[PDB]
Amino acid sequence: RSRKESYSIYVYKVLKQVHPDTGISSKAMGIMNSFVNDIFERIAGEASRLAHYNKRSTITSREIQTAVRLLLPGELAKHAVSEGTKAVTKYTSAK
Amino acid sequence: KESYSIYVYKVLKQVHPDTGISSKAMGIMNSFVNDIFERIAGEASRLAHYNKRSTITSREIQTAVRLLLPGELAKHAVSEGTKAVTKYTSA
Amino acid sequence: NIQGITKPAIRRLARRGGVKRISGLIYEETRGVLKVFLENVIRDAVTYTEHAKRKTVTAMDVVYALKRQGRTLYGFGG
Amino acid sequence: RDNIQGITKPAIRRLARRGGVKRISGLIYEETRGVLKVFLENVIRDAVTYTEHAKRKTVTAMDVVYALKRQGRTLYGFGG
Amino acid sequence: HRYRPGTVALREIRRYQKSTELLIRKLPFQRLVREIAQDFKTDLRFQSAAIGALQEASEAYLVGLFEDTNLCAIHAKRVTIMPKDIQLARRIRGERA
Amino acid sequence: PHRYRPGTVALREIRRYQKSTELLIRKLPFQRLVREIAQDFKTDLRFQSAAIGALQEASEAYLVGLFEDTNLCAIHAKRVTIMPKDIQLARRIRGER
Amino acid sequence: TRSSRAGLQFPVGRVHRLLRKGNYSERVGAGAPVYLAAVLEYLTAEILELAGNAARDNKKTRIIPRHLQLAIRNDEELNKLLGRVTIAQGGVLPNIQAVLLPK
Amino acid sequence: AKTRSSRAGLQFPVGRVHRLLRKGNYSERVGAGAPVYLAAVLEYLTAEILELAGNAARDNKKTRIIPRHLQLAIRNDEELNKLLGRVTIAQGGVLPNIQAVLLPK
DNA sequence: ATCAGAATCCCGGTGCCGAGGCCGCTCAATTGGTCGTAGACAGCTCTAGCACCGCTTAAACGCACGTACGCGCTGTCCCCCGCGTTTTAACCGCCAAGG
DNA sequence: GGGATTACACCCAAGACACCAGGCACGAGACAGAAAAAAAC
DNA sequence: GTTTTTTTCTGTCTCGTGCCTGGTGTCTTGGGTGTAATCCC
Known about the structure:
By secondary structure, chain A is an all-alpha fold. Helices cover about 75% and strands about 0% of the residues of chain A.
């Protein structure tokens, strides 16, 4: 039996965080998995173009930041950059 | 940082051998060639990752050229590619 | 053939579009544009399955062909 | 300042004529200016962001090429 | 007795903006897709989920193109659609040359 | 004199501008507008001229396409006079809101 | 897990694996997947938060995809993002041109 | 024939393309026939479009191809126009589109 | 306005079914340890981006003025809405005669 | 009944080094070419 | 207005070389498919 992938449990937990009293359909969970897929793919393609228009092959978080604020529209993007940056601080401040 | 200029000159002399060209015409042509190369190559990389094949042979390139260009161009391109495969494979 | 498209089907298409009043030649014009749409879609879908070396077109290949026409659709594992 | 008003009516005329437009109404020009402005807003925002990660205080032609390829309004001619 | 026209159509517009269920039902749509699929390589089997995908994408596609065509006709100082309206909308999007 | 009730002027200049090759918007005011928009997100940025020429090229092409579909909207409107909501309908269909 | 060590909810190393097998670069840094995972996390938080409000509207408990399409089509920046996006069981805006309403 | 270009009888450098594939982060490995195949496709595309370029430039008694020639030759094609639909050429312009409602009748 | 009456909304009701809990696995994240060069950084050099001005001139602006498409209106004529009537695509229940 | 899994085959790319004539930058002189301006329709 | 038909003066382009750098010949080895058995849905 080949082991297949999903992101269902993760975003499921996130949904339980932001709304404890809320159910969901299974197809919509698949939709959100496809959503994460699509956003990830556009980001990664912008990362590869970041590489080739920078002639470098290392990926750091700075490239991810500039990729996100290339793709996403402004206000949403800056909030997301804030969330990611504070997470970078909280992780890399410890181990 | 190489452009494809004399390649264009030799194609041109193979087709309309009494024909000049401007500089920026060559620039647009090389822009064109790079765009086409990038689109096909990325589509082939999609073929690999959508098909879990760890490398790319010519068959992937054939089906990608099918996926990009429409009918007449596609069939003539498949013909030219297989003829090149044939003559390079013979020697 | 193409005439399996009923008149009230394209009428319902106007209704979910929200369109009120309907002319005559609309029907055959609709069937034609739908045909060309499905032609390009299923052509490159069968191109995907040709590379797949398999005798059934995958839903995955349908999804990726929609991506290839810039028509990205979620929902069915894409 | 006010270079948005540097857009001239005869330039809009010339663009309509190569655009093939015959008859020109009078309520068109500032609407045209606003659409052109929003266009160039998104364009130069993305180009400057590409140059932000470039760590060079000067934006190149290549940058604008890459940014407009990102919008899908992709233009040849200058390499990229 | 007889109702006055235009009313029932808009009432069912308000009804048909609600359920996202598929408008064209299955079997004839499947036959049409199979018949067009016949002329590329002979007799290919199909996943039914893929058929539902084709059905979904086709119906949403046509609904949106209807929306733009309807707004074209509203601009055209009229209420009823015309085939030339579809030609105008397609000429803006760029399917046909 | 030869005042000429109209028709040859506009269409003749269309013939001239479609025989034409080069730009129409002249350089300096467009450049200054570019720098004013540029002075809004990061200050004090320098530029090479070819970038600005590409910007001018794609700008005029963008507006040419707007004018073409606007022209066909007007022709469908049984008019030759353009309107603003023509352009609004054209950008509505182009998905560039 | 690094996600817990980042105090977040998306698995880092799965993403680090997928970055490797995507031919995305030659080498992969340390905390770039953390940043990307947090980006994903805030995105899905915002989306499904509006979806939760959409369920609050209809007084539904389980999310139907119609809620998702509606919440996409309401917000501005999200709809400009997902302009070329459609969803099965999507539907559209309940929208009527009042010039076609009767008098 | 020492060079693979002479071994293919073509005009493009193949090992160029193979290094482009290697310095592409495209696949992990690249076979031997794919770069030749793709380069042949490229060479066909060049010759095919330069045919329409040659006729379109010859339309105006000018030995040199200008960008306006290229845009004309593209828009006068059908497959290339649906190819280059999202595509714009520098110094291009568009076709003569004089509507029939405009000529003095 | 205004009543009658279609059309729709909306409230228990029950049922059934899949969302979600749950639980025992095992394989990739981890943990730790070992080379290594890519890049963060210091610093050199010359280009080009910028600013400025003088001279030239063609290009814009304002107005004079007719004028003619845009438009509001009109009459008209026709042909889609819709409701009714069969009616046939579709999926269920009976005659064939051959085995 | 064909697609999914696996397994044994085989076989030539990756590299790693050794040998190399082309590839392009720069110039030159020529050579296709835009316009000046008669100059018809 | 269109367009054609003379010089002219004229900008680019093709020839012309030298420097060089990537392109080429080939073994080992390995994994990456090639193909075939089989379950299996």
